[PDB]
Write a protein that binds this ligand. Structure first.
Ligand SMILES: CN(C)c1ccc(CNn2cnnc2)cc1
Lengths: 412, 412
């Protein structure tokens, strides 16, 4: 019968910092991690800025010899995973290694590496493709390499659900534990899609903000002057652990994961429906899964991408799910500061939701100068709002109409 | 407790045929789908052959215009899925669409699209990248496009566990139904990595057979003269259904899915351990999940890739798990005929395991001319073997040390 799941460790790389506390400091201070991209020449691109990880040192975690073989999305996923495991205080032993697994996902995976090897193939032939092209680029290799380095022999897999990946990865990992398939899971996601094909491909869809001359103001969820999402890189990992297993080893418990919802819109390849019907179905699934009255919800970490249709669909969904209580909860988009980490978005935003519970503060939606028509909820405009938070919800919505909702609450 | 899950619909594209019955007819006749790859300059490559899908007509499924937006791996996944749903006879309605979901995965995803868009980018800059590059290349778009086309509102996701994808996709979809999150799931995988990058990438790791003079003899699992796997394309999809749901509408039930195991080797990025310890834990997990004794297993669809180390690890794992019953069961690699469909391997092999149960016959391992040292099990060399099969296992062991096992049982 279904066991309870708590969060005992967290790890992160974001545009705001090389760990959780540094990133959260930036979140509570309203700081933007968005800047013109320095790592390649984007003068021919319509978008030339994004949320880069600044000053990442892979040699805090791995040999440079092993790092050279791995796409940045794998290096980022391993860094966040290592941080989460260390933060948990868990010791991997012969007695528990079969009960500890990993589900770290990505939306796009090793596009930089695949692009670079495509370059080698086209210009020089197949004999110049890296021997490590496959294991250094495919999405399941965060889970694979983490298992090899720490000796995790539990369920080992990866999700890829576009911008929903980090949320689904955490929810499904919690089900593994809830249903007895594992006692511990390291779960989350990682992304580094800031290569020619990434920026070019989202550019070709006219999905990205083109505010090149004021990049810190580009990400403006629910603002009337928003013009698309900001592309961002990084990773989030959580250690999920069965409650009695956590109690039995004296673990520090940050919060309890009480609810997980999924739904499909079945509407459009890329566009969300204006009424947010699939997001509403997903949130209602999560709240019923958590055994909650919707009025218990205090804080929502929105998907809040800064797209015209996505932002307004989320307002419509929250009003539909929460009715008059929609005016009492606080909802913010931390993508206003971090930009959109795609497959890692749900992983870092799950961490932000847990820290909202720990610190009793709703992070701001920065850049919300002029809320759009019908965007009249408490969206925590400009500045962090200290408040009572017993229940926090984190939403993600992605291409294919794929929705995820996580429900966290304080643990006593 | 837990609901029972049965298979009510199957769909496939393989190197043996454009549907299940054509493919299965090839399998039972010991036919090879392996041939030199056409309409592709493989001059500079060490491997020039594989398992292609022959004569696929996407306009049976999609308009030309909608097909132009999608990588071949997505087309293949959608074709298998549509076939599976048609085969099931299921009627999607407003009363049941929230209970029907999708989990179709891929190991490598849209290499062909990435290749062609790299060519645009490198030759003409980013403004010539297709607007549909991202949604037409990402792995979750088989689930996405299927959910949109058929109006499926249930759990919508995609696994990516390299060569284990199809097995994990089916197993996790079965968990959704068993634990009441859905009544129907479409599950499986698809792959089209026969581009320069796939043949080049695996070739750079010298993972592929280089038997260019005799492509149909290349895939020879457990044969002393094997020299690595054969790269193959296609897709498998199953309709998984809660038993009472299937009986209420008078569905034809092929077989019951009674067990699912997962494990991690935590050993090496690409090679399994010599003793197959992780594959043994995974099979034991799957049998425990099914409440079955190893002695009850009749037929194993091996991973059987024709790699020196992988083939021998599976022999060791089966001797360890099955002890005095290890010789009584039959174990065969259908990869001897199909080649290795990577993320779709476990999907087509689950279908072959179900058909082994329907027709009471172990498919052959062709090309098994000289068993290697210690390969003395009943490997069904050369020709199909009619026999009693109540319980059939299907195993997948992929990069990252990720393992999956499915347990199917005859249904009456
Ligand atoms: C591998 N080949 C030969 C290749 C690589 C990059 C470029 C374009 N960017 N570049 C970098 N260094 N010079 C130009 C052109 C050809």
């Amino acid at each position: 019968s279904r066991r309870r799941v708590v969060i005992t460790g967290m790890g992160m790389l974001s545009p705001l910092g090389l760990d959780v506390p540094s990133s959260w400091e930036g979140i509570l201070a309203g700081r933007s991690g968005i800047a013109p991209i320095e790592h390649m020449d984007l003068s021919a691109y319509s978008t030339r800025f994004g949320g880069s990880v600044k000053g990442f040192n892979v040699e805090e975690y791995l040999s440079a010899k092993e790092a050279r073989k791995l796409d940045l999305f794998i290096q980022y996923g391993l860094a966040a995973s290592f941080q989460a495991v260390r933060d948990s205080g868990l010791e991997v032993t012969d007695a528990n290694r079969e009960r500890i697994g990993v589900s770290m996902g990505s939306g796009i995976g090793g596009l930089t590496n695949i692009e670079n090897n495509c370059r080698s193939l086209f210009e020089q032939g197949p004999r110049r493709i890296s021997p490590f092209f496959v294991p250094g680029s495919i999405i399941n290799m965060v889970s694979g390499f983490l298992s090899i380095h720490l000796g995790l022999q539990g369920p080992n897999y990866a999700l890829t659900t576009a911008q929903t990946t980090g949320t689904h990865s955490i929810g499904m990992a919690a089900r593994n534990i809830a249903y007895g398939e594992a006692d511990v899971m390291v779960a989350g996601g990682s992304e580094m899609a800031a290569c020619g094909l990434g920026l070019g491909g989202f550019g070709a869809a006219r999905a990205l903000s083109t505010r090149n001359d004021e990049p810190t103001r580009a990400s403006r969820p629910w603002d009337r002057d928003r013009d698309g999402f900001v592309l961002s890189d990084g990773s989030g990992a959580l250690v999920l652990e069965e409650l009695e297993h956590a109690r039995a080893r004296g673990a520090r418990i940050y919060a309890e994961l009480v609810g997980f919802g999924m739904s499909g819109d079945a509407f459009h390849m890329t566009a969300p429906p204006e009424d947010g019907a699939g997001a509403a179905r997903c949130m209602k699934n999560a709240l019923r899964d958590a055994g909650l009255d919707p009025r218990q919800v205090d804080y929502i970490n929105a998907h809040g991408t800064s797209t015209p249709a996505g932002d307004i669909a989320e307002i419509a969904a929250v009003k539909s799910v929460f009715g008059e209580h929609a005016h009492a909860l606080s909802m913010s988009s931390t993508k206003s500061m971090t930009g959109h980490l795609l497959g890692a978005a749900g992983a870092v935003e799950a961490i932000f939701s847990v820290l909202a519970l720990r610190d009793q503060v709703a992070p701001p939606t920065i850049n919300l100068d002029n809320p759009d028509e019908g965007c009249d909820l408490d969206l925590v405009a400009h500045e962090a709002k200290p408040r009572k938070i017993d229940v926090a919800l984190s939403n993600s919505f992605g291409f294919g109409g794929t929705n995820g909702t996580l429900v966290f609450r304080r643990f006593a």
